[PDB]
């Protein structure tokens, strides 16, 4: 297979304005949302049809309870952080946990915490330690690292349990997560715009080459964007030189297939 990733996000906001929730939790396999929970619904609900189809009510009832607890725990350590920083008003607190299953068979695990959208605490499962970006984080770190049973737990979960979940979901959503839709590539003029659309997965490689050598460097890349139908689109541009004749060609790579469009 390709590189597949499972990643779960949690957001905590201190003074949510108006109808904004104070706690949100969403799960992703690759680029697809699979499960969601907010402080208003207080339920864990499917966000993909193949998730609702394959997981018994037991699952949703069990994880609903757990997320209610996490809503509490996050509201409490957002308070302790905000006191240590001496920060008034609004601040955010985020958490990302997850796996990656690489094509070659290797894996990666990661668990991170964030404050105001900045790195705050990063876990290293290979050294069983927490990296702190400041001294507020350093204070939290010293307590966490004193409980090595907890650290050993996280290492085991990231390396075995998360990966196991991912394989489980990859099969649930096989018809979606493991399909290939090749890109449609064309070349426009204004600078040559190499434009691709209608492809999945969204991982795509585009570049311009002059006379057989890569432009190193002033290619202008466009972001990979969702089309709204499950496919994606992107582009790359280079300005054409009016002094010299040059063979410009756009190179696209996608799911193991290389493509060349010459001009």
């Amino acid at each position, epitope marked *: 297979m390709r590189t597949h990733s499972l990643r779960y996000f949690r957001l905590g906001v201190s003074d949510p304005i108006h109808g904004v929730p104070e706690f949100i939790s969403v799960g992703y396999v690759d680029s697809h949302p699979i499960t969601t929970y907010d402080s208003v619904t207080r339920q864990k609900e499917p966000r993909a049809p193949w998730m609702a189809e394959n997981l018994a009510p037991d699952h949703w009832e069990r994880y609903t309870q*757990l997320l209610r*607890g996490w809503q509490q725990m996050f509201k409490v350590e957002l308070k302790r952080l905000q006191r240590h920083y001496n920060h008034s008003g609004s601040h955010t607190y985020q958490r990302m946990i997850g796996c990656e299953l690489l094509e070659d068979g290797s894996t990666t695990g990661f668990l991170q915490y964030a404050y105001d959208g900045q790195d705050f605490l990063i876990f290293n499962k290979d050294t069983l330690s927490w990296l702190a970006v400041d001294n507020v984080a350093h204070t939290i770190k010293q307590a966490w690292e004193a409980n090595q049973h907890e650290l050993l737990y996280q290492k085991n979960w990231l390396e075995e349990e998360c990966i196991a979940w991912l394989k489980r979901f990859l099969e649930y959503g096989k018809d979606t997560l493991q399909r290939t839709e090749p890109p449609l590539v064309r070349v426009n003029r204004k600078a040559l715009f190499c434009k691709a659309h209608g492809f999945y997965p969204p991982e795509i490689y585009m570049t311009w080459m002059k006379n057989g050598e890569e432009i190193v460097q002033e290619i202008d890349y466009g972001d990979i964007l969702p089309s709204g139908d499950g496919t994606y689109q992107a582009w790359a541009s280079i300005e054409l030189d009016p002094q010299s004749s040059n063979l410009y060609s756009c190179h696209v790579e996608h799911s193991g297939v290389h493509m060349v469009l010459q001009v």
Partner: antibody, heavy 109, light 115 residues
């Protein structure tokens, strides 16, 4: 699964060494706990294993093999006060505890 | 201190109402009610992940619970039955979900139900 197996009763001599086995067949693995329960009393935490290897705490040690799906609690230099029931408990994929039926340790003086 | 549970003993007729009390002063979020029976491992009746929610365990039938606050988690026998004869243990932990956190048990309560 899900299933945890533990011998019903074990007998060993004072001063000797005893090894209480715990084999588990669960849906995922998030850690294995050992508990000590004296007759008439409440269970109290003994040890916790989640990664392969042997962890020592005094006269007691706990070993874990994730691949083989088993753990043992080792008690060295047995004393009469070690006479109790020992409970094995595994946390599954959904962080729920499965409890073994416990093992009653009888110590011959 | 620790985990406090009452009563330690109780005799009940069929089928009588009964409420078991449990309190913890360790500022724990998750609390539990277990029943212990000869020949089998502990069985969860009900649990409470945190101060504002509870849920069924493995053997919820014939029971109900109330997480009154962060400290108190009460078990309730609706109508006593001979099969409910058991030792009941209250327990609490820092967090029921992710973690290496262990359980802290209460002294236990022996209920005997007779005709």
């Amino acid at each position: 699964g899900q299933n945890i197996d533990q011998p019903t009763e074990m007998t060993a001599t004072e001063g000797a060494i005893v090894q209480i086995n715990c084999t588990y067949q669960t849906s995922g693995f998030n850690g294995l706990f050992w508990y000590q329960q004296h007759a008439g009393e409440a269970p109290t935490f003994l040890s916790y294993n989640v990664l392969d290897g042997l962890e020592e705490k005094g006269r007691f040690s706990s070993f874990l093999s994730r691949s083989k799906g088993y753990s043992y609690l080792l008690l060295k230099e047995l004393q009469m006060k070690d006479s109790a029931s020992y409970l094995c408990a595994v946390k599954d994929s959904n962080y729920q505890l499965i409890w073994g039926a416990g093992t009653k340790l009888i110590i011959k003086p | 201190a620790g985990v406090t549970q009452t009563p330690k003993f109780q005799v009940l007729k069929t089928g009588q109402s009964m409420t078991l009390q449990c309190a913890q002063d360790m500022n724990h979020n998750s609390m539990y009610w277990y029943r212990q029976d000869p020949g089998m491992g502990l069985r969860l009746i009900y649990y409470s992940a945190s101060e504002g929610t509870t849920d069924k365990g493995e053997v919820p039938n014939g029971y109900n619970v109330s997480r009154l606050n962060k400290r108190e988690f009460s078990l309730r026998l609706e109508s006593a039955a001979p099969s409910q004869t058991s030792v009941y243990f209250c327990a609490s932990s820092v967090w029921t979900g992710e973690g290496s956190g262990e359980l802290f048990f209460g002294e236990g309560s022996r209920l005997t139900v007779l005709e």
